[PDB]
Structure formats: structure tokens, C-alpha cells
């Protein structure tokens, strides 16, 4: 329950991410692709690699779907709480949230089984990597995989002002708080809850933003040291594993950041609507 993030990107929808599994699955995807791009004759294996990863993802999602009944119960409680007795309504929110997390933990073994399959497949591909001479293995796999799978994400990140998104959220949180205090009720207890929700979401966004910024710089510097050059086989495998670690850590926070950003602004509409209702209707 410490490494589980909850997202609500759109009204009436809820999902969850077990953070170490996302990172784990993502890591072995980079490792697999690096293993097939090292030789030009194994490029065509990408169809099989894509198809295996797709099967793993569907298998993982099918395990997630087992908690759909508990999940939709929580969703309908959130709708009641966000669309205006509050202690009873909030107590039912915490208990339903607790059932969701217990449902997720009761399927850890199913989740781990699918994760171990991805690891084994990626490692089997990794183990077949060969060189013309082990004293100077090529790094074409590292270069190609970066150019075709990673570079677009680094540029998409660099094209954003993630720090400004945080200041925009902090200002929204501060101004909405100062609004509550200079007010004058079921509408008040509701606004305090969504504000508390948006505040936790914001701290999660801030957590991932810091990661993205660190990893953005780390990746861009490390990739320069690992391409258009050769390495002894032991060193090549080490750098591939290191790149795949950086990539997966970057991709997890980037992924979660976007989903959390959407959740924050999905909640803000409720906040704004309940404020406009407390003023113009009442």
C-alpha cells in the first residue's frame, strides 16, 4: 500500500498503479529491445517482442480487473461525496478505499507471476546477445533503441515546463484555500475534502516531477557515453542494464505525473463548480 498510486483522470473513472511492477515491466521491455537491436539480423524480432509484451500487459490488466467490483463501489462513493452526514460518507470512503488496496494486495502473487515471465523473456533475449569480438562489442542497439523509443519522450518532457505546472497548482490550492477562509454547511465539508484530495495528488505530482527532472539530465549525459563507441562484453551488458534502469525510472514518474496531472485538474472542476454553486445559487 506504500507503492500504490490511485488515478482518477476522468469523471466516473478510477485506476491504480503498483509502481515497482510498472518499473519492473518497463525495465525488461528496454532490455528486450536492446537485445534485438544489437545485431541487424535480429531487428525483425520486434514483431514477436511487441506481441509478447502486449500479451503480458493484457494478462496484467486481467488480474487488475478482478478488483472491478470493489473498484466501482469506491467510484460510486466518490460520486456521492463530490456531488452535493459527512462523517458517515467519509467513513464509507476510507473503508471502501481500504477494500480496494486489500483486493490489490490479495493478487500480488498473480501480479508477480506475470512480472517474472517478463523478466525471464527479457533475460533470455539478453543472454543471446553476441559480438564479433568480446573485447569491442558494438553499441548500435543502445543507439537505435534510444533514438527510436526514448528520445521522443525526453523531447516531449523538455518541451514542457513541469516546474511551472507545480506553481500553477500551488496557486490554485492557495487561492481556493483563501476563498474558504473569507467565506460568509454540506458544501464546505465537501470543498475541504476535494481540496485535501488535490493536495495529496499535488504532493505526488511534485514527487514525480523531481524524478523526471533528475532522470532527464541523467539520461542525456549517459547516452552520450554509451554510443558511437565499443565496450568489452561485460561492460556493454552493464551499460545496457544501467540505461534500462534510468529509462524505466524516468518513464514511471513521467507516466504517473501525466495521470496525476489529469486527476488534479479533473478534481479542480468539482472544486470550481461547488464554489460557483455556494455563491450564485445559495
Amino acid at each position: 500500500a506504500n507503492s500504490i498510486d490511485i488515478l482518477q483522470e476522468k469523471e466516473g473513472h478510477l485506476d491504480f498503479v503498483i509502481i515497482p511492477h510498472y518499473t519492473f515491466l518497463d525495465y525488461y521491455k528496454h532490455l528486450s529491445y536492446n537485445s534485438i537491436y544489437h545485431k541487424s539480423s535480429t531487428y525483425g524480432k520486434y514483431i514477436a517482442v511487441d506481441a509478447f509484451i502486449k500479451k503480458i500487459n493484457e494478462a496484467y490488466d486481467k488480474v487488475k480487473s478482478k478488483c472491478n467490483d470493489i473498484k466501482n463501489d469506491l467510484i460510486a462513493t466518490i460520486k456521492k461525496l463530490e456531488h452535493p452526514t459527512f462523517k458517515k460518507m467519509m467513513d464509507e470512503y476510507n473503508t471502501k478505499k481500504k477494500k480496494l488496496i486489500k483486493c490489490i494486495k490479495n493478487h500480488e502473487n498473480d501480479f508477480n507471476k506475470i512480472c517474472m515471465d517478463m523478466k525471464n523473456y527479457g533475460t533470455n533475449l539478453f543472454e543471446q546477445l553476441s559480438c564479433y569480438n568480446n573485447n569491442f562489442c558494438n553499441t548500435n542497439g543502445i543507439r537505435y533503441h534510444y533514438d527510436e523509443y526514448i528520445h521522443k519522450l525526453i523531447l516531449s518532457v523538455k518541451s514542457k515546463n513541469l516546474n511551472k505546472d507545480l506553481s500553477d497548482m500551488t496557486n490554485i490550492l492557495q487561492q481556493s484555500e483563501l476563498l474558504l477562509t473569507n467565506l460568509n454547511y454540506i458544501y464546505i465539508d465537501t470543498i475541504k475534502f476535494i481540496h485535501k484530495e488535490m493536495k495529496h495528488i499535488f504532493n505526488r505530482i511534485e514527487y514525480h516531477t523531481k524524478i523526471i527532472n533528475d532522470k532527464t539530465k541523467i539520461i542525456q549525459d549517459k547516452i552520450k557515453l554509451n554510443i558511437w563507441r565499443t565496450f568489452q562484453k561485460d561492460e556493454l551488458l552493464k551499460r545496457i542494464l544501467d540505461m534500462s534502469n534510468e529509462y524505466s525510472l524516468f518513464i514511471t514518474s513521467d507516466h504517473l505525473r501525466q495521470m496525476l496531472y489529469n486527476t488534479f485538474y479533473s478534481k479542480e472542476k468539482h472544486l470550481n463548480n461547488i464554489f460557483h454553486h455556494l455563491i450564485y445559487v445559495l
Partner: antibody
Amino acid sequence: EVQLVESGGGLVQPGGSLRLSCAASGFTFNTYWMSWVRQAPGKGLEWVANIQQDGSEKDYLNSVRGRFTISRDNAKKSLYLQMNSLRAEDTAVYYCARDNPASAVAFDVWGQGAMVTVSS
Amino acid sequence: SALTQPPSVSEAPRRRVTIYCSGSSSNIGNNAVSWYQQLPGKSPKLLIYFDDLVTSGVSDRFSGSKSGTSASLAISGLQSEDEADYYCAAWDDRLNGVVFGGGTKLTVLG
């Protein structure tokens, strides 16, 4: 390269006990689910048992529950099938197999097979 | 057996062969289908898994498919070397075990 070698087959009396062993090599045995599959002479394949990497989950064919125990020892890279209360219908070649992907329940590596005969 | 396969199928070389695996919603309908080739006197080997993935090293003439409660294995550009017994398997939720098909013997003509 990847290899699975069975041992411990033979003739057993009905109601008797027999233990099969499987020596694995050429792969990280500790990271995979492992299995047993049997084939009666001239007949089809029939799954017997699966076991998780650390042994915490074990699955069995309905007709062998309570009588058979699948076990492993990752340090020795060995798979086991303790067969108790043997019946004539248990007579078959028993294959040690690797279950990969385990989410797919796929027997991707097979041994040479160990003959087990339950007769009076 | 919970999965129904033709006892035998046959086709001339250079052509395409299909082998069906008929099951139910507790097995094929909800689980991944595997396919195996067993040559005479040999141990079985995996051909297809996750319904339609081809195991590494297996020829691309072997393909898999599944829809509803029925799965199928296709062999194209047939060779007499393909003469063997073919099995389908999948997990069954009601039995909590693997159900195997009864097998299909492949006869290459001519």
C-alpha cells in the same frame, strides 16, 4: 544447452510409493515455475502438477490430489514428484517440464521422460 | 476430454492444414491456449502459446488463433516432416488444472 533429466522411474506395486527427480541445467531454475506431465503408453498427454519458483503455490490434476506431492530444491536445481498410493491408471511416462510463460501455463521445455509402471 | 480435437486430419504437401481445439468458457474462452507437436518416439515440444505466439526457434509455417470457445493451429507449406501428433491445452477455471486435448494425428498425403 537448456536440459531437463528425469530419474527414479520403475515398477511399483499398487498402493506403493515412488519418487521422481528432475535435474535441470542451462538456465536459472530458481526464476521459473516447473511442471510434471504424463503420457500413458499409446495415449494422450495429461497434466500432473505445477509449482511456483519458491514452492509457495502448487497445482495438481484432480485425480492425483492428496496422493502426489510436487516439490523443488533451487540450490540443487531439482524438481520432485513424490507419488504415494499408486494406482494402475498412474502408469505412464512422466515428463519434467518448464512452465514458461507461467501466466500462459506453457510447457516450453521437456525432459526425456521417466517410465513408471504400477503393477502387482 | 474437456477439449475436443479431430482424431486425424490430412492434406497434401505444399498446402495449408487446420486443427481445431473445441473447449468451453471455463477453459479456452478465458485462458491462453498452448499447442504441442510430438514426433514418433520423441518428447513433445511447444509450438504456440498465449493463443497465437510462436515459440522462438519454431518455423513460421505454424500459426495459432482462438476466438470464442474454440482455438485452431495452422500449418502452411506442409512437409512430410510435419507428420506427428498435435495437442492443444489451456487452464480450466472450474477444475483449477490444465486440460489437454485428446490429440490429432497429422497425415501428409502423396
